[PDB]
Ligand binder design. Structure first.
Ligand SMILES: [Zn+2]
Ligand SMILES: [Zn+2]
Ligand SMILES: [Zn+2]
Ligand SMILES: [Zn+2]
Ligand SMILES: [Zn+2]
Ligand SMILES: [Zn+2]
Ligand SMILES: [Zn+2]
Ligand SMILES: [Zn+2]
Ligand SMILES: [Zn+2]
Lengths: 207, 89, 130, 89, 89, 53
């Protein structure tokens, strides 16, 4: 079931595999027929949810339509056991983008620090997404740190009823480097090391 | 500077009223047993008592919320109907 | 009188009610976050233009460092709270408690002497021109 | 320092969607006449056209909102019923 | 200096989420055919497949957006109803 | 825009608009329709230019 989930993730993320929607519908029907003669649906659902988290917390615009086909096939195959939670975390992603718009409007009204420019912050719930390991306690690069502070303040003043937690094992960023100005990309893992390098170069593992 | 951050795409997590210091049902703690378990070892066989998480992001002991399912189950910290979305802290 | 202007009277009373709810709202906002440290004790009020005769709400004057950061915090938090309220600054209303310092006697300024006293704190020996 | 402010008791004023740059009914401005007045002097006798303020803190020309009272009057910028709480900017 | 600029009256253009690198419907590119065209010459007669521009400033292949008009047409990148405001990049 | 309306990206162009160039015996203000601004700015930086420059 894990390999089946990986295959369906590869077919659902990479649009090259299966160009015209004609051969896509047939291949999805064949995949669900193959899954019909399969046991241990729990691990399949768990890995499908993990793949959903991987594909929705990364670059979007993957299909913006095939998700409806996937959930419709799941409804006619699994039923109403875990599909409801799937559409619930999809609604969480809608809540995420609405709160991103809210933080944009907050930077528009205030935005004290320049760190809060185009903040693509997202808001999710602990129950839906498997983010129970949301406690990497690490330092944040000055400007992004100030941006996070501002966002927290705004969201709280808005619905004062949520305990926002800080984490690093999710998301991405665009690092503008500088003969031309080529913008790099850091997946919230290299931001602290690169910020320390900016503060002072010639560091090592001990530093 | 040599490297300047332009965009940031963080994700924020949040919980409603979990009260780490106290189960809202049992008032002992989010962890460390419940009112009907008391001794940690006793006869538990790895302490089946875990933490139950609902769609309303409220956290209690699984034993704490299982006793409330019999009667009205409205997640007494709000008006949302209690579900079972996650097991274990 | 009847029901001609009494309704508007109770409406501005409800405006006072809304104002005090907003007081504790911003209190909790500062208690949770409140980056501005000048927010030691805030007693801000929120009223509507239609009910109270505050049409002359445009005295454009400077605000003293600590309470000025208080006002910054206020604006930011309140706007997050309800995007849709045109926060206008004014000085011809309210009061304040100035803690002076042999004992520590606390004075009182009705938002008219705050700027002059803050300028004196920044630098004494001023005059009308200053 | 010699004098430190401890308490502040300011009062904040606010408006819903007055749009100083444009009457939401006429789309000319909050001031400077309306669509049905045009010339400022003409035959106006001190320009009776003023600004009307409602309980919903929305501002239009008095002429702008008087034409909407005949039909449905729901203050089309919200769901509140339009009143007359202040005249003149 | 001898000549100093006082006023500037520039005009700024902008687009919502065109994604030059990828059609949000087909995920190939803003140009260079679509999923249902593949070969550029084939039997196309100057490649009728063009880029469709809507009132919501979103850009896809004309073939990409023509297949979505049959079902719900809400410009799935936003809530605006899709129109046809420009043809060709 | 990046701070406020971040739901779009802007593109730079020159074939539209105008400008008022304050020249300087009196101070007469000229007008450039975003076509002569670059050439006049280069002249301000250094005069005696040609087509190659
Ligand atoms: Zn408990
Ligand atoms: Zn127990
Ligand atoms: Zn709940
Ligand atoms: Zn008007
Ligand atoms: Zn009029
Ligand atoms: Zn209104
Ligand atoms: Zn396409
Ligand atoms: Zn095509
Ligand atoms: Zn659109």
């Amino acid at each position: 079931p894990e390999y089946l989930s990986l295959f369906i993730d590869d077919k659902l993320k990479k649009g090259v595999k299966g160009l015209t929607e004609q051969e896509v519908e047939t291949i999805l029907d064949k995949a669900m027929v193959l899954f019909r003669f399969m046991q241990e649906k729990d691990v399949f659902e768990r890995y499908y949810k993990q793949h959903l988290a991987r594909r929705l917390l990364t670059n979007k615009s993957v299909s913006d339509d095939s998700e409806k086909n996937m959930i419709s096939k799941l409804k006619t195959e699994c039923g109403c056991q875990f599909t409801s939670k799937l559409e619930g975390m999809f609604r969480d992603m809608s809540i995420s983008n609405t709160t991103m718009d809210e933080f944009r409007q907050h930077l528009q009204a205030t935005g004290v620090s320049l760190g809060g420019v185009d903040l693509t912050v997202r808001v999710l719930t602990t129950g839906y997404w498997p983010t129970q390991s949301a406690t990497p306690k690490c330092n944040i690069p000055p400007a992004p740190r100030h941006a996070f502070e501002i966002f927290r303040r705004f969201y709280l003043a808005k619905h004062s009823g949520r305990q926002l937690t800080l984490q690093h094992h999710m998301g991405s960023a665009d690092l503008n480097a500088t003969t031309r100005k080529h913008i790099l990309q850091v997946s919230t893992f290299q931001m602290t090391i690169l910020m320390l390098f900016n503060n002072r170069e010639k560091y090592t593992f001990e530093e | 500077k040599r490297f300047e951050v332009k965009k940031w795409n963080a994700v924020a997590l949040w919980a409603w009223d979990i009260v780490v210091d106290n189960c809202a049902i049992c008032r002992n703690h989010i962890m460390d047993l419940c009112i009907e378990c008391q001794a940690n070892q006793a006869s538990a066989t790895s302490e089946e008592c875990t933490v139950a998480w609902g769609v309303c992001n409220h956290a209690f002991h699984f034993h704490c919320i299982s006793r409330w399912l019999k009667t009205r189950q409205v997640c007494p910290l709000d008006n949302r109907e209690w579900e079972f979305q996650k097991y274990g802290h």
